[PDB]
């Protein structure tokens, strides 16, 4: 269930290697989670859906971090709303969507870090382009979970995630 | 999903290692598919199938007829009560696999130096091959097979459930 | 390499689910990896370590210091024995030496109702044991195959590491 | 060792899915040979003199030798065989310059194609061909039992297999 989904998140925040001085731009899960495992780290979210937004700020509340997270609107023109530059960046997919990556590699100070997940054929095709241009590393995770069927258990193989992780030059 | 069907038999067929003058018992899950291709891929061979439904037997043998391998297949009923019909000792056995008593029964009929290839689809099934491997010798391999899968604007590579496959020679 | 050694730590931390006033027993392979992160990821926690080597205990605590986590870790010797000298019952346990004679039943007697243990297996022998302890105390098993680029010449391949099995449970 | 290589060929041959009296152009000798065993023929193209020497060696050892023709390197050698192939295998490098276009040219419509890709590069290329000409991409994650006092399951490298019929 949400199992699969927590195992992905753990891999994302690990890649990102939070320091406390630093501010995330998640492009409402990876942002919120970055707000519970490291103090003095703030997350900026960008979300084109009002409804999904009402949701990110909503759950921001459970873990008492709501006033660190800023839920913004959609890429990439939302960035101009945010004058304060980023240090670490998460794109959990949506790399294929134009003007978006370009726009954000720009808002990123050199020495600034990046992690991108890709779980489509097109998504992953992206990761290799960006990777082959700016460097960084690609690793991937094949995760399966235990599934019962009346009198039988099997190992449901989740979809694979590729993860780009780069430092900027 | 029918691509998984294709790819899995092949591996099964790779594994079985069909030669001149050999007989295959093809026992259990979807009895006939491996028999029919065993019969196809190789000249001068015999297959026996074990099928419960009077009418699932009436689709295995009908199909054989078509590929022209009706000559060399028999369709018996369900094992191991149907092993007691078939008199000659088989050369190779395939199980697609944990029914009460079907292994030991079928196995009391394989002669020294015979070969059997079994496939697991559940964990209960997987853990068994590990224990029949312990005594009986043999070697276990694994197959995750993925097929493109296009939801709307995006392909992913959707994984089938993995398949476990035990291939040993006896003695 | 050290990158599945990072990534495996991550999944084990997320699984252990650290909360306030909690005490981890971190037992077995590489005792300390999970502990100092467990400690260095959540204010207000104590972790317990069980290492056999006098020289390895000296380096775990060294690193707990160098992470300002010196004052919430005890570094004991090997279980199951070293359980007998640690007085307070653990809140969560993690095993990564998953099958030493005795460690588990021992580790286990010490765990309260509705307490949590997450274990790692990397071999089949370990893996089929999680499956047996799974069948007693409940809980759930998932598995991780992690790959990294491997540029053997002009051609990168994606290069799989050995899988890893993880049992997480509530007593 | 050669095991995982056995599973590999077992798969290609299925997707290749031979027909009686069909010609194959296999662009080490594995699949040409394999093609030839299970009245069909095979044309091997091989840059490698020392492997060339080797495939005829195997075709004889196994015994379909006057059914196999070990050619030289592609795509240059392509023009040599004036007789059109009915089915192509690329297990070889499909990113190798001019190799792919040059043989899709020799392939009649209704002719089939199995392509194997086992690198990041070769796989990314395998998607480019798929987009233009069609066909299907599947991938197989094969591991094997590997034993000190323990057994573990060594994951082989994954194969992306492209299979397509020509329109
Ligand atoms: Ca010469
Ligand atoms: Mg009737």
Instruction: Find the angle CA(B81)-CA(B85)-CA(B90) to the nearest 5 degrees.
Output: 100
A67, HSE (Cβ side, Cα atoms, 13 Å): 1
Q: What are phi and psi of D121, to 5 degrees?
A: -50, -60
Nearest ligand for residue D72 CA: 1
Q: What are phi and psi of D46, to 5 degrees?
A: -140, 110
Any idea which residue has 């034993």 for tokens? D147
CA distance B31 to B53: 11
Burial class (CB within 10 angstroms; exposed 0-12, middle 13-18, buried 19+) of D66: exposed
SS3 of chain B = CCHHHHHHHHHHHHHHCCCCCCEEEEECCCCCHHHHHHHHHCCCCEEEEECCCCCCHHHHHHHHHHHCCHHHEEEECCCCCCCCCCCCCCCEEEECCCCCCHHHHHHCCCCCCCEEEEEECCHHHHHHHHHHHHHHCCEEEEEEEEEEEEECCEEEEEECCCEEEEEEECC
The angstrom resolution of this structure is: 2.2
* Cross-strand bridge partners of residue B150: B155
Pairing of strands D112-117, D87-90: parallel
Q: Residue A128: list chain D partners with CB under 8 A.
A: 120, 124
Nearest ligand for residue B55 CA: 2
A91, A152, A163, C16, D33 from A156: Cα distances, Å: 26, 12, 21, 22, 37
Identify the H or E element spanning A14. helix A2-16
Its domain, for residue D62, covers 1-167
Residue environment code for C87-106, b if the CB has 16+ CB neighbours within 10 A, otherwise e: eeebbbbbbbbbeeeebbeb
Q: Which residues precede chain breaks (C–N over 2.5 Å) in chain D? A: 27, 38, 147
Contacts of A93 (CB under 8 A, 6+ apart): A116, A117, A118, A119, A120, A123
Distance B49 CA to ligand 2 centre (A): 19
Q: How many CB atoms are closer than 10 A to CB B125?
A: 20
Neighbours of C, requiring at least 3 CB pairs below 8 Å, are A, B, D
Distance B54 CA to ligand 2 centre (A): 7
Question: Positive or negative, the Cα torsion across B85, B86, B92, B96?
Answer: negative
| B25 token code pair | 């018992």
Question: Positive or negative, the Cα torsion across A115, A121, A123, A129?
Answer: positive
Contact B7 D14 (CB under 8 A): yes
End-to-end CA distance of chain C: give it in Å, rounded: 33
Distance D49 CA to ligand 1 centre (A): 7
B141, B143, B161, C27 from B11: Cα distances, Å: 10, 9, 15, 41
Give the residue among A148, A7, C48, D10 at the shortest CA–CA distance from B14: D10
Instruction: Find the angle CA(A34)-CA(A67)-CA(C67) to the nearest 5 degrees.
Output: 40
Cβ-contact A25, A86 below 8 angstroms: yes
- Interface check for B156 against chain D (CB to CB < 8 A): the answer is no
D79, D90, D94, D107 from D162: Cα distances, Å: 24, 9, 11, 16
A30, B77, D63 from C26: Cα distances, Å: 27, 55, 61
Contact B143 D138 (CB under 8 A): no
CA distance C20 to D104: 65
* Experimental determination technique: X-ray
Q: Residue B123: list chain C partners with CB under 8 A.
A: 131
Q: Residue C157: list chain D partners with CB under 8 A.
A: 118-120, 157
- Interface check for B3 against chain D (CB to CB < 8 A): the answer is yes
Give the residue among D65, D58, D38 at the shortest CA–CA distance from B14: D38
- Interface check for C170 against chain A (CB to CB < 8 A): the answer is no
Q: How many CB atoms are closer than 10 A to CB B158?
A: 17
| A92 token code pair | 């959990």
Residue environment code for B72-105, b if the CB has 16+ CB neighbours within 10 A, otherwise e: bbebbebbbebbeebeeebbbbbbbbbeeebbeb
Domain of C142, CATH number, reads 3.40.50.150
* Extended beta strands in D4-90, E state: 23-26, 41-46, 68-72, 87-90
Cβ-contact B155, A121 below 8 angstroms: yes
Residue of chain B whose Cα is closest to the Cα of C132:
B127
CA distance B10 to B18: 12
Question: How many separate domains does chain B show?
Answer: 1
Cβ-contact C60, C39 below 8 angstroms: no
CA distance C14 to C168: 10
Q: Residue C131: list chain B partners with CB under 8 A.
A: 123, 127
CA distance B75 to B80: 14
Residue of chain D whose Cα is closest to the Cα of C153:
D119
> What's the longest Cα–Cα distance across chain C?
58
Give the residue among B137, B92, B133, B98 at the shortest CA–CA distance from B116: B92
- Out of B10, B147, B162, the one facing D11 most closely (by C-beta) is B10
A43, D116, D155 from B158: Cα distances, Å: 32, 18, 18
Give the residue among C50, C12, C11, C48 at the shortest CA–CA distance from C30: C50
Cβ-contact C49, C60 below 8 angstroms: yes
SS3 of D77-116 = HHHHCCCCCCEEEECCCCCCCCHHHHHHCCCCCCCEEEEE
- Out of A122, A123, A154, the one facing B161 most closely (by C-beta) is A154
| C133 token code pair | 């302890």
Cβ-contact B30, D29 below 8 angstroms: no
Neighbours of A, requiring at least 3 CB pairs below 8 Å, are B, C, D
3-class DSSP state for residue D68? strand
């Amino acid at each position: 269930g949400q199992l699969t989904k927590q195992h992905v998140r753990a891999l994302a925040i690990s890649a990102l290697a939070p320091k406390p001085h630093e501010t995330l731009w998640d492009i409402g899960s990876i942002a919120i989670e970055w707000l519970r495992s490291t103090p003095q780290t703030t997350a900026v979210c960008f979300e084109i859906s009002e409804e999904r937004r009402e949701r990110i700020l909503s759950n921001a509340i459970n873990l008492g971090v709501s006033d660190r997270i800023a839920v913004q609107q959609g890429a990439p023109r939302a960035f101009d709303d945010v004058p304060d530059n980023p240090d670490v960046i998460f794109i959990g997919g949506g790399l294929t969507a134009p003007g978006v990556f370009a726009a954000a590699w720009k808002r990123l100070p050199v020495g600034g870090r990046l992690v991108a997940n890709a779980v489509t054929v097109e998504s992953e095709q992206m990761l290799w382009a960006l990777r082959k241009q700016f460097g960084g590393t690609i690793s991937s995770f094949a995760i399966s979970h235990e599934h019962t069927v009346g009198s039988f258990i099997t190992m449901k193989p989740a979809l694979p995630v590729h993860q780009w992780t780069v430092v900027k030059a």
